[PDB]
A paper describes a structure:
α-Amylases (α-1,4-glucan-4-glucanohydrolase, EC 3.2.1.1) belong to the glycoside hydrolase family 13 (GH13) as classified in the CAZy database, and catalyze the hydrolysis of starch and related α-1,4-linked glycosyl polysaccharides. In DMA, the nucleophile is Asp186, the general acid/base catalyst Glu223 and the transition state stabilizer is Asp288.
Crystals of DMA belong to the monoclinic space group P21, and two molecules of DMA are present in the asymmetric unit. Domain A, which hosts the active site of the enzyme, displays a (β/α)8-barrel fold. Domain B is characterized by its high variability in α-amylases depending on the origin, and as in other reported structures it is flanked by β3 and α3, and participates in binding a conserved calcium ion (here substituted with strontium due to crystallization conditions) at the interface with domain A. This metal ion contributes to the enzyme’s structural integrity. In DMA the conserved calcium ion is coordinated by three water molecules, and residues from domain A (Asn98 OD1, Arg147 O, Asp156 OD1 and Asp156 OD2) and from domain B His190 O. Arg147 belongs to a well conserved motif and is present in more than 300 known animal Amy sequences, but not in Caenorhabditis elegans (Lys), nor in the paralog Amyrel present in true flies (Muscomorpha), which has a glutamine instead. In the DMA three-dimensional structure a chloride anion is present and is coordinated by Arg184 and Asn286 and Arg325. The non-conserved metal ion which has been identified in the electron density is highly solvated, being ligated to six water molecules, and performs only one direct coordination bond to the enzyme Gln263 which is weakly conserved, even within Drosphila.
Author numbering: 1 to 476
Write the structure that this text describes.
Amino acid sequence: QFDTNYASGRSGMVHLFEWKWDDIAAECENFLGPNGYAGVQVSPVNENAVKDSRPWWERYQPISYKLETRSGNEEQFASMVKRCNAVGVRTYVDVVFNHMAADGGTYGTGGSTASPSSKSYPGVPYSSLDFNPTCAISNYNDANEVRNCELVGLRDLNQGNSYVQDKVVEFLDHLIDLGVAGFRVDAAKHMWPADLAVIYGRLKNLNTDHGFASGSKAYIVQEVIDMGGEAISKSEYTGLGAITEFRHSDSIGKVFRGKDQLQYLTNWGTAWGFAASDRSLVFVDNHDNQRGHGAGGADVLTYKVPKQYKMASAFMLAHPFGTPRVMSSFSFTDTDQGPPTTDGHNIASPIFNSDNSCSGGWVCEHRWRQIYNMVAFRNAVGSDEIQNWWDNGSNQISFSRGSRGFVAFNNDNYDLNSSLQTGLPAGTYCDVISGSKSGSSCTGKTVTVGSDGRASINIGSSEDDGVLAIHVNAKL
Ligand SMILES: [Cl-]
Ligand SMILES: [Sr+2]
Ligand SMILES: [Sr+2]
């Protein structure tokens, strides 16, 4: 429940927001696999309610547990898991069993129909007896009202009923048979941990046919928003699985936006109020946080602030704390707007340029050179500890991961021109933020490390990038 089940020597979970299964399987073999990524988080794979203008949040109003979405059907989803597992990329499913669709959602994405006014869902065989009595969440400080009342009209299921427990376990076991490696449980704060423990304990072992070790259990990351000093604590859930550490997203936004100083990052971890490292799923932004009014509000860094979003992603991928997750979104100017379509419904596949960058309505942050080359940085340093910390007392910091990698940041209004201790063997290194290694040359900046371990690091305060990075797996 705490082991990621990652393949050997890989790191980084990519949330391919609203991608279809066919496009995900191709991206596993063409990019994610040969670039060292560890896993992919998919949108809900079960049938959801069809709503006007096809908003993104329609996929969190389940109609049934049939694998029938705009992303594809069960046959395409199963082939996607098999093809991604063959290149070493695991699959983690966003699962929604706290509620069903609200009023106005009579049609499903796979042919099923429902009647939320009577709490009747013929696809799951669900009846009104399987739900909590109708009530609305208004207080948010009453831990009983948050877990038993209806969230924005969504029909609150009763996870204490043995029939509901059967259907959820039946659905999660079906996904395990298809080769899935873990689950992201949506709205976990609105459910009782005692009932979650029963569901989690009944799940079968992982399918060894997909290259899983015998005795492997499904990875469990729980979506809990705990900004500190709340009625519901994240410690209620850290005993049953990993949690979404949203303090990481809100703090990393404040720091790299200038609202806090970079020198304070010297004790990044539980000293900043985070959960345990082996219990923390960390990220810069998520599909909710990037739209505002999330857990971090306006302080969250998104792709729309590219220079500081890349610096924040580079710091997270270089720090040993937690399990990093990188967001891959589609461009939006309206928080309700859904993914790009070829008409008004059929999701349009992403297209790629000579950059290996995305187009056609998708941003593809995981294909940014500054992001996927830092994933290689994480894979090259392993479990090496932080050493050689330096800072100027403001917004210029640098540290090394053992003797295998070095990174430097400049968030001040003036340049960085210092001879810093790098901790690496002497030689010539390619700046992995500004380029890559090709044969015996560097695409971007070059970094020369002297016999004393010191190197000249230069990051102008007006350059497009505010971070430099080098590691031993990109020498010469
Ligand atoms: Cl999340
Ligand atoms: Sr609930
Ligand atoms: Sr200080």
